Amino acid sequence: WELSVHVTDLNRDVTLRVTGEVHIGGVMLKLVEKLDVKKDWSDHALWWEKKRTWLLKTHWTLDKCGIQADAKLQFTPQHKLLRLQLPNMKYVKVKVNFSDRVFKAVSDICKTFNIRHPEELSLLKKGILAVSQPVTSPEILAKMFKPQALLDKAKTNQGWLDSSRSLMEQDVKENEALLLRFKYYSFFDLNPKYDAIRINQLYEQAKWALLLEEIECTEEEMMMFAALQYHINKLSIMTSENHLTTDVNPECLVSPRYLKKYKSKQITARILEAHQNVAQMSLIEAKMRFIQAWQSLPEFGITHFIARFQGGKREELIGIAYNRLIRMDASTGDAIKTWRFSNMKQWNVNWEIKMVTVEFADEVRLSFICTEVDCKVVHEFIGGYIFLSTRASLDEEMFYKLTS
Amino acid sequence: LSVHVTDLNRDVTLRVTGEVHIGGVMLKLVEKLDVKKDWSDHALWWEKKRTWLLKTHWTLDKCGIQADAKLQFTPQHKLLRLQLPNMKYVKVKVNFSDRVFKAVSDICKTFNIRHPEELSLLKKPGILAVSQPVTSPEILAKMFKPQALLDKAKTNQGWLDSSRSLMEQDVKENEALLLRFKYYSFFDLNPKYDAIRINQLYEQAKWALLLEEIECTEEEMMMFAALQYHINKLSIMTSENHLTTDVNPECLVSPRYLKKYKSKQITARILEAHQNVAQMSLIEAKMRFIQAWQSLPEFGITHFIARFQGGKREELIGIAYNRLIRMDASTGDAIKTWRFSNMKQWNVNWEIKMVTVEFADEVRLSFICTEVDCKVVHEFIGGYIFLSTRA
C-alpha cells in the first residue's frame, strides 16, 4: 500500500509505496531518499499518533507493528523543547527526549539542574534554580491564590505523568507547560554540602504551599514560617555583601600574628570572602529548618484521590502517605481509617471495574474504586513509596516492576 | 584552746576538757564574745593539719585536737572572683568547706550551666549570656602569652582537687580562680536549655584560638573569624524590633491574614517571631563554631610532663577523652597513642609517682610524673572514664 509520513520540522508530508514486509528502518530510508535533502536525521524517529506509539525498533517489519493502509504516521525529532515550572513558581525552557520514559526524563532533567534523587520528583499537568526571593507585593499572592479545596486538590493529582511511558504518549506537545514537583514526601539524605538547589526548591515548594494555603497551619506557625522567610532573606543578602556593615573591627577576630603578616585592608577582605561562605551555609540550614517544620505539620505528606469504598454513601478520599493509606471524608478532611505500609503484603488493581485492592496483615483487606486515570496514578504512588522504602545507583528496573 | 575569729579579728582562749563536742565549743565561743550577729555561715578550721571541723557531733578527743591547739573560727562562704571562659571577672561566693566538685555544681546551677562535671577550677547575671568581640586589637596583644607546651603543662598543675575543698588547697578570699571547661567531652548540647552553657563554651573556644592557645591553619583562622563576625550580626538581629530589609512582611503570609490584621499588626508579630528565630540562629552559630573547634587536629588535649619507658628527656603525656598520647615536649608531635576504648584498667604507684595503664591484647603503658601531676592526672583519667558512662 501507500504510507503517509509527515516530517514535522520540515513541514513536509511524504507519500511512500510500501508492501508491509518492509522494516521500520527501511521506511526511514525511503523517507530520506525521496526528500532529497542534506540534513542531520540523527534525532528523528517514527511516531504514530492514531495509536500513540513510537516506532523505535528498527528491525521490526510493518506487519509486526500492525501498520494498516493509509496510516498517517510522523517523522519527528525525539528531543523537543518543554516549558517547566519549578517549585519556585518560575518557568524554565528545557530540551528533553520525548521518547524516553518520564522517569528517565526526570532524572536527566534533575542531573542538569544538579538535583540529587530524582525519584522523589516527577511531572504534573496543569542560577534560576539557586536563589530564593520573596514576592514584591501581596497582590501577586492573591493573584496566584487557588481554590485550594480538598476535592479540587484531588482533581489536580490526576495529572501525574506515567513514569513508565513517554511524554509524547501522554498528550504532551512541544513548548507546552509541565510542573516539576516533589511527588513523594520521603526525602533521602538531604545533604547541604551537595543539595543547594535540591533544598532550595524543596523549601520553595514548602513556602508556596503555605502561602497559597494548600496545607494548613496555626496562626502561630504561620508567623514562624514568615519569620523564617524574613531570616532567610537577610541571610541571602549577607551572601552578596562584600563590605563591612557592623561596628566590629575585623582585626579583633584574628590572632595577633596575622596583623603582622597582612595589612588591615587584606585581612578585612579575606574575612568578608569567608563570611559569604558562612552566610551561604546559614542560608541553607535556615531553609532546612523551614522544611523540617513543614514536615511536622499534621496535614503533611498526603496525596488526595477521589475514591468510593465498599460501604460508602458518597465520593470519599484515599490519602497516600509515605507510611500509610488513609480513608478520608471529602468535606471535613478527617481520617476515617488508616492502614500502615509496614503491614502490607500484596496490592493489586482490577482494571475492569477500576478497583484497587490491598491486603494487609491481620487479614484485613482494603478496596476502593477510582476513575481509570486515578487507578494508574494511585498504583504508581503505592509502588513508588515502597520503592523508596528500600533506599539505604538506583535500580530503575525494580522501580518499573513495582510501578507497572 | 586557742581559737581565732577572722571576721572580728581577735582570738579567744577557751577552757576545755577535750571531752566537749565540736558543737558545744562553738556555743561557748559565742558566749565569751558578747556580740549580736548571724553565726550561721561560721565554722572551725586549723591550718596546722589542713582540715575543717564540720562534724559537730564529734568530741575533741578523737578529733586529735590537742591542748592550746591553734584553731580558727571562720565563715565558710568567702569572696571569690571568677574569671569566666569569656575572660571577664565576676565576683561570687561559695562554700569553702564543700568539695570543689560540689562547689562547681553550685556555681553552674547559679550560672544556669548544665553538666558542671565538664567544668572545674584552675589556678593562675546577663554577662553570662552576652558575647561581644574585643573593641581593639590592642587588648589582644596585651593578653597574648608565650604559650609553649611546657608552659601549658605547667599551668595544668593548678587544676584543683575536686574531692577536696578550697581552704585545703591554698585559696584565700577575694582572690581569683579560673572557671574553665576541663573535660572536652560535651554531653547534650541543647539550644533549648544551654543558652549560657554554649555561649561560655564558645567563648573558651574563641579565646583559645585568638590567643593561640590552640593552633590552626590560616584558612581555619579566617573561617573562625568570619564565623564570629556572623555571630555578631546574628546577635544584633535578636536585639532590635524594626524592619531592616526592603521586604513587605505581608508578602510572607497567606492572604487571609491581611483581612484579619493591619500591616503594623502583621509586622509586629513577624518581628517578634524573628527575634526568637534569630536567637536560635545565634545559638546554632555558636554551635558550629564549637564543632569546627572540636574537629581541629590539636583539640581536646591536656598536657602533663612525663618520663616514659624508654624515654630520653622530659616528654609529655597528653590526656584526651578518647585517648592519651606520648608526645614530644617541644614540637607536640604524637609519638604513640593509646585509646580508652581498649583500656582494661589503670593503677597509680604513689611511691614511684608512676601511672600504669593496661589495655586489651596485652599492651601495657607506664610513665612517671610529679607528685602534684599524679594527683591531677589521676583525676583526669577517671573523670573522662566517668564521662564515658553518661546515658
UniProtKB/Swiss-Prot annotation, chain B:
> How would you describe this protein's topology in the membrane?
Peripheral membrane protein
In the UniProt record, does the keyword Lipid biosynthesis occur? no
Q: What happens when the gene is disrupted?
A: Complete embryonic lethality at peri-implantation stage, due to severe detachment of the endoderm and epiblast from the basement membrane. Heterozygous mice lacking one copy of Fermt2 show no visible phenotype, but show decreased tumor angiogenesis upon transplantation of tumor cells, and their blood vessels are abnormally leaky.
* A single GO molecular function term of this UniProt record: SMAD binding
An annotated GO BP: positive regulation of protein localization to nucleus
The free-text tissue note of the record is: Detected in adult heart muscle (at protein level). Detected in heart, skeletal muscle and testis.
Stretches for region Interaction with membranes containing phosphatidylinositol phosphate: 21-62
Q: How does this chain assemble?
A: Interacts with ITGB1; the interaction is inhibited in presence of ITGB1BP1. Interacts with FBLIM1. Interacts with active, unphosphorylated CTNNB1. Identified in a complex with CTNNB1 and TCF7L2/TCF4. Interacts with ILK, ITGB1 and ITGB3.
Write down what this protein is called: Fermitin family homolog 2
Write down the species: Mus musculus
Q: What is the lineage of its organism?
A: Eukaryota, Metazoa, Chordata, Craniata, Vertebrata
Gene, per the UniProt record: Fermt2
